[model samples]
Target: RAVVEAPVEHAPIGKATLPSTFEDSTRQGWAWDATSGVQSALTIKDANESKAISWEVKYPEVKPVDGWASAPRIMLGNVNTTRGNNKYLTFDFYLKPTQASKGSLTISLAFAPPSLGFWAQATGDVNIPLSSLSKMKKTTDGLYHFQVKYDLDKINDGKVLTANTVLRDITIVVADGNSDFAGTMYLDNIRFE
Candidate 1:
């Protein structure tokens, strides 16, 4: 029989000292990288608390790398040394397409531990398709509420994310292989706990 993976049941203890609600000018260590064929904007918008990061991307043309047409790396910045005590990285998003749409969206996370080498191979980078995220539902506003909370302890064969895990420079990658697509994703309450 095939096995189906269930959602993580662990509860967050508390919010991290470094959290990003996009409330002000401070990016809170969040940044995005842009390359050929992709136009991106990371701005603040009025949301649950009148503040959330609005990430819009439009790619009428795309430059493919390896197999992905657009694979943008978003630097989430250093989660700090307290990452070891936290077991999950949580965030909520609302995605809507304002233009052309024809592509598959995938999101991956990368973490670096003390003495860990390449992030992709060492941590395997926790890659997953956006549609595969189970915690989603359409709201009254017509956008889907998407919640992502990944288990840190489950990565790296349980060898990493230990007490001495020097967590920082964590990254999130959005990869799409389609030749063209355009959309905006609103991010809020990004934290580790």
Candidate 2:
């Protein structure tokens, strides 16, 4: 048997602040700051598709971290914070390889400390090898749905999740072993329910 609660309408819970490298543009919702060396972009093309927004990134051939720069991380911030005894995070998005290579994408929900800094809690890591592409099916529109869930209640021992305890941002990172690689990946339809 299944129990369903009444639909809870979500108001404009919070505001989303984009990274300086992002720009809102047509076709794609956003374009990256090539000048900044963070080659990433996002756009919402259609509402009929499973995912409305599309995310793209062009990796650098040279490793950014090894070269003293930080790895390119696409971040989404100011997520809605919910309070309850049974709060959980449901993320739905799609990923497809535009340029194939051997690497993995890491998704993390980051918590910001008021005065100190921040930390990340991950949803485990997913490795997408070139060989695995054949096993995955793309949407009719050429996309793949990648979904995962995290129990928010477990984030801070069921304590009162103040604004600080809530995850206000998300980071998608790609890593090639200890270095970074050059390639392209697309993402869309990121939601929390």
Candidate 3:
């Protein structure tokens, strides 16, 4: 007999909302269409409503290619946990890239607060090589599961985060050096494990 830790199932902990600020049409070093319907850009509110999360442009109109210049990003705000004590903040979601894009999707997790300074207190970024794209099969609903994990302990000690001390946000920026192509990327089921 073996003891197994069952996978925790969280039923959409947040509500769907869009970012307060955004810049459309590839500018300011990044191009993002925060509007809904165009690329299905939106966010989900937590079950308690204390915070809000996002599921940005999944079905992006652009793809990764040589000298490609396009990137989409999502930002989450005011995330604090009662189980504070240096817990790990995990991001779980699905990602499906269509047309076998040549470049890879780089996911970056960042935390910050006004007082601390510019930049996240802690961060983690993963570059999923395009070569491995084939192994990523789409689900019946047309999406794949993608998870990004971060450790809070590395940022703050046991002390509670100040009112200004918050997990400012998370961003998914497309590398500027990507190639060119068009495809649909579906992102769903995002949560903190």
Best by TM-score: 1
Per-model TM-score versus the true fold: 0.68, 0.56, 0.51
Alpha carbon lDDT of each predicted model: 0.55, 0.42, 0.40
Error of 3 at 99 (Å): 1.7
> For all the candidates, what are their Cα RMSDs to the real structure?
10.7, 11.8, 13.5
Q: Which prediction has more favorable lDDT, 2 or 3?
A: 2
- What is the TM-score ranking, best to worst? 1, 2, 3
Superposed Cα deviation of residue 85, candidate 2 (Å)? 4.5
After superposing candidate 2 on the true structure, give the runs of residues whose Cα lies further than 4 Å from its correct spot: 1-39, 66-72, 83-87, 113-117, 151-164, 174-189
Give the higher-TM-score candidate: 1 or 2. Answer: 1
Each candidate's clash count = 0, 3, 21
What is the clash tally of candidate 3? 21
TM-score for model 3?
Answer: 0.51
Model 2 Cα displacement at 117 (Å)? 4.6
Candidate 2 accuracy as lDDT = 0.42
* Model 3 ranges off by over 4 Å: 1-40, 43-69, 78-83, 153-165, 170-181, 186-191
lDDT of 3: 0.40
Reference-based lDDT, residue 118, model 2: 51
